[PDB]
Symmetry: D2
């Protein structure tokens, strides 16, 4: 790693050990939003890593973001997803597709932890099938009028703004303030894990927003959504790496100190093998993530690469966390140790920002297009 | 299946649907012992299936037990482990190794739902390493004196008797201990990932005196009793794992038939079809292993390797099936509105208790090789 | 297991150890059809097991067949597939769908190892897509006229008769071999099961009598599908034999190979590999026997046959792989039988319906059970 | 990738396409050592990639070697192992541990494809247990006398020199082995019969039998008792070569399956229109790209003079298991055509299998990884 990125890593790891490890159990048990910690992170630049310093951000790159995301998620996975949604899914598309004015109004006040945003694509009847949005935007006067329900929205209860995708005929993106007349929140979902982040429906009933609330041009929405998810996928890959790293750390320390049949568990061959496979899966997932980050930072294509990273990391996080429980034994099954929380948090990384199935379809599609292109050059 | 085992399956299915399915979510949410339902199961003979009627049991066999155990656990996994501990781990060793008088005293009042037992082998410093028991039993006058802590005892807070293993020096012995009794305190209930309706806690013995006739079998038989008990228990846990797997698969199939994506049900996607075929294969395979082990036990044939195979297969299937059930549900899989996330949490214990998967592999390997050496 | 089935197991084991184990390497190395051993098997009844003794069969059941199949295949995988093709794919449909006269003409002469048969469904352009058959049968007078090429036909170069599927919409036909209008393609050069022959059947204006049709016109696809259900139990069992011999090999070796001061079997890792192998095999055998018993009791067994074949074939590949790994360097050379088991195992995931087709068949039945 | 490494990649691909692809079926079928092709590779620097130009080498690095190895092995797996043995196992130790005079005598004439070497560590009695060498070397006057059988020596029947490991001191149990440079032929050395192998059949494998074999005193590479260390550090490098070989086998297997799947029809469409086929292909691509990044990390650590034992073991482990899984799935996608020699898939499956065994089995790799993982946590 570069020197800068090494220092960043140490700052983030110190933060995580100081501020996140001591609350992780509480945040999870009580489904508690980590308010004070998100705000401190805001001051550190972690909620706006890839945002130009001129717009109020850290002025860093996606590799730095990937590194920071891992270290944060290692401390608290919920804190990780909150940070990832703000960077990749909220601020991301606004920097990419927004006017100078939209950036001033909707980026800058959301860079410091005073306000955060959210991303609303999924609906109760469709999440993988993104283009099947039934939520409608209709132009009427100096306004777009929004009607429908978005589902599963991370940060719904804490967000001051949302990038919302609505059918205009055919999908468009809109900047929506929160709260706003004609927008109500559903009840907070009761989740298996990442319990400190809020997840709730967004309910639009003749919600009016000004005409310049549209992000990009009408019909650009599906493309805005897909490109934003490419970036988001790197963030989720990093979160999954943090979850996996901390689960592995937990297994190693335990197994070194737990005695069985006369010696530490780490004298048993089978334990060494579990641990070696855990380390291989994690390091492999990490390199795929950094590849995808560096490609994005060099303005090269990264769709296949982000899908691979998210896929590899999420499945490693679930495998590794399972094996951490197994190595701990009975201690793995109770809330006295952190391993059972790891297994619970890990499990969402295979679902959100495109299920594993979707990721494979994306990779396959890009694989097959690349070979078809190479074939055509002959003709 | 025999006509009689078909009628049992239906009785159990009908009972789980009426009595367990409606309470499963609350039991899990509140960590709440299903006391009324256990008493009802007691009355149906389900807490003493392989006990002779003359001792107040159902007079059935281990095949019937595995079937009933699967149907119960399909309904509620916690009720499952509670039924299994009483049947296999508590009542089982007393039927196998007890005197006639011991069976009348310690089996018969635990055959009907009013009293249940527990099994206490594991300790804080040792669970897989069973023979490392540092709980001590010392002969003093008219009593055995017990000192030490047992850990992870399922049914600790509701149990009226325990089979406790303690070092007396072939250095371990098995003891019938009443609960409550002077010198015994319970630890705090464990806060578990799943099977939250079952209680789990430490048994703490300080100068705990029990009569000399409390010993089960002869002194030094303890390790053997424990190991042969776990063999029977493992068929019970395999059957619980099957029930968790079956209900997770039922959940995924009903959901996928009704959820639309890209114009049609999820079950029209080839990928989803493949998930469900793998799930069905793993489950049916595990069930046959389980039934093989039960039938061997029933015909008074060895079944150590076969019970370990069943427990290993079933339990790893439960975890794989329940994971895939969540995946098929999508977002709905990650929330308590659906039961998928509960099956995932419940399935996970089955790879740990009554011998970890690693312990299972070592047992299977040991018996494999003996079979080649005797050929 | 019944005592009758217990005795059959020992006869087949005895036979395999005397007649098959000593030639397995040669059969494989030289791609050599094991003609003398197949004749002896014919004399024992192994090539006509589920056939009534009135038609010269053994008069046994599919459970007996699956046991015998596993013992033969443990001895030599090519002898196993030759025997399975004759029992399940040739004689099977003729028994189930043929007339009295058809049985006497086409079964009775093929029950004793003098004459064996074959089953021709696949074509160069379609194997999984079995209904896509482009070979044609036209009715010209008191004959059928066949035109087209069938592909991958096991026993092609040794068979005296074939059950051939032709588009008429598909029908089944008994074709004698040799016959005017029929020629054989070159033998395939295979990764494994090299002692069985595999080749194309090429029909050019091939004329056969009108009474050659098996069942009614249009029944062909159903006859083919019901045949492959039976065949799948056979391949399951072939696969169990390969797997079993691979595991026998590994255990003997590991007990007697020293490393770091003890046998390999003293290493915890080797014990785990062995435990997983035994678990995969034993579970696959139970699925396989469930399918054979459902068939013997006239119960549906499509899904169960599919599960048995899928489980058994995937176990044969995983176990043979681990057999090579336990042997180390010795696993990679022809001095040991492990590399041959790896090569033989691999076909069982492909023929009689690929693993992917098995999963589709299983899923279809599963969903219908819930409807 | 640097422009230089991009040129090299194209050179090796072109060579492979021009010289290796057309001989691979024959080399495999007939167990034929591809001597003309190895000589040409020699002229291009491929047999001495990390050797300085001043000793007659290509003057490049291990990243270049890894890239070159993958392209060579894609064309012919046997040519790949022949090249890897010469680079990593023969030349490697001489460059790392040899004197100036040893480099001139034993490196320089083995850099051009006229003479290649071999590496003799394993014995009939022991491979994984490398330290149990019973072949002996006794100091007799001004000479060393060797007695014993080495087993499994790649290039045995074509080599003009060997790096040979022999027991020189059974009293000092951790300084027990020494390394020796031995010419081929030499009085006292005879070869065993060539092994009949599942795959990589163009390479020779056979026993080296020493009986009263006297070699001069300056034949010892490094100090007496250093042999086990020289051998282990040599295998660390070799593992990067073998990982690259395995990538090449996996890549050609994947190329094969994709071409077939796009062009084979079933149920009225190409196989690639089936989801399950797309899934098979996505998993293949992910396993390969992941293994490649692990390999490049290890090569890069070596080239930067950093520790790479764990990383080399991870790479060899990931690549070798990917090659076997990918080649297995290539056969499955071809269906019947996958089982016959008319297509190359069955050969890729046979070649891939060796990569899980030699230069330290998969089991040894996991023990190595676990050991270094644990040491990191302790430090
Ligand atoms: C805690 C949580 C937080 C979330 N955060 C956000 C957020 O902030 N903003 C937002 O917009 N959304 C968010 N999501 C939505 C999330 O991305 C979706 O749940 C996910 O995309 C899957 O969509 P779905 O739940 O509708 O499942 P479905 O689309 O019904 O999928 C069900 C199953 O079918 C599979 N499937 C679907 N299509 C195909 C296909 N073509 N081929 C093969 N298989 C297929 C899926 O992979 C899955 O296994 C969140 C969800 C959760 C649970
Ligand atoms: C909810 C719950 C209920 C339980 N019910 C009961 C009960 O009613 N009564 C009772 O006595 N106990 C009970 N158990 C205890 C249970 O059986 C043990 O947790 C289990 O045997 C593992 O023992 P351990 O927790 O001490 O883990 P450990 O023995 O510390 O093992 C930790 C890891 O090391 C591995 N390991 C251990 N030894 C070896 C070895 N030799 N080779 C390879 N790997 C090894 C294990 O497989 C595991 O992966 C229960 C546990 C729980 C969590
Ligand atoms: C040695 C050998 C012996 C054989 N014996 C006989 C014999 O005696 N008689 C006979 O008639 N045939 C025989 N077969 C043919 C064998 O059954 C076929 O190879 C098998 O059906 C696969 O068909 P295919 O080769 O045409 O491959 P394809 O049908 O082209 O399939 C290629 C790949 O696509 C997959 N695929 C195809 N359709 C689907 C789908 N809908 N969904 C998902 N995946 C799909 C396949 O599973 C496979 O993975 C033999 C083959 C061999 C190699
Ligand atoms: C074609 C070929 C080429 C080769 N090239 C060379 C060469 O050029 N020079 C050379 O010196 N050698 C060479 N080798 C030797 C190769 O590196 C060995 O085959 C390998 O190290 C395994 O050694 P073994 O065959 O003695 O197997 P064994 O050591 O007998 O092992 C057999 C099984 O036990 C396992 N095992 C052994 N020890 C342990 C342990 N402690 N824990 C867990 N599992 C263990 C192994 O993983 C393996 O699965 C070659 C081998 C082959 C087949
Ligand atoms: C052949 C194939 C494509 C079947 O799917 P498809 O072509 O769609 O055929 P189906 O959907 O079953 O429909 C055709 C009829 O065959 C019938 N059928 C299918 N399998 C049957 C079986 N096992 N028994 C009886 N009937 C069967 C179906 O019931 C169906 O009847 P209807 O038209 O009344 O609905 C595939 O699923 C399969 O099993 N292929 C076999 C591949 C194989 O084994 N190849 C190697 C053979 S030689 S080694």
């Amino acid at each position: 790693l570069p020197e800068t990125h090494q220092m960043l890593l140490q700052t983030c790891r110190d933060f995580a050990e100081k501020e996140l490890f001591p609350i992780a159990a509480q945040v999870d048990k009580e489904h508690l939003f980590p308010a004070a910690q998100v705000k401190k992170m805001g001051g550190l630049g972690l909620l706006a890593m890839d945002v130009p310093e001129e717009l109020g951000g850290a002025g860093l790159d996606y590799l730095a973001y990937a590194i920071a995301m891992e270290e944060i998620s290692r401390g608290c996975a919920s804190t990780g997803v909150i940070m990832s949604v703000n960077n990749s899914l909220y601020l991301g598309p606004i920097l990419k597709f927004g006017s100078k004015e939209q950036k001033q109004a909707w980026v800058t006040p959301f860079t410091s932890g005073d306000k955060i945003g959210c991303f609303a694509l999924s609906e109760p009847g469709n999440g993988s099938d993104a283009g099947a949005a039934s939520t409608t935007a209709r132009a009427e006067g100096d306004s777009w009028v929004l009607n429908g329900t978005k589902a599963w929205i991370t940060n719904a209860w804490e967000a001051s703004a949302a990038v919302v995708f609505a059918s205009t005929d055919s999908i468009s993106a809109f900047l929506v303030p929160m709260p706003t007349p004609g927008l109500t929140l559903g009840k907070k979902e009761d989740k298996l894990g990442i319990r400190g982040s809020s997840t709730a429906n967004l309910i639009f009933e003749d919600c009016r927003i000004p005409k310049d609330s549209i992000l990009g041009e009408p019909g650009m929405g599906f493309k805005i959504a897909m490109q934003t998810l490419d970036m988001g996928r790197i963030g989720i890959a990093s979160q999954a790496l943090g979850i996996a790293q901390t689960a592995l750390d937990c297994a190693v320390n335990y197994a070194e100190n737990r005695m069985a049949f006369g010696a530490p568990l780490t004298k048993l061959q089978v334990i060494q093998f579990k641990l070696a496979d855990m380390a291989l899966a994690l390091e492999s997932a990490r390199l795929l993530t950094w590849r995808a980050a560096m490609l994005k930072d060099n303005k090269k294509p990264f769709i296949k690469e982000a899908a691979m990273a998210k896929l590899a990391a999420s499945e490693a996080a679930t495998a590794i966390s399972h094996q951490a429980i197994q190595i701990l034994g009975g201690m793995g099954y109770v809330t006295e140790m952190p391993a059972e929380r790891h297994y619970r948090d890990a499990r969402i990384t295979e679902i959100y920002e495109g299920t594993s199935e979707i990721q494979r379809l994306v990779i396959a599609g890009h694989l097959l297009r690349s070979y078809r292109s190479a074939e055509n050059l002959y003709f």
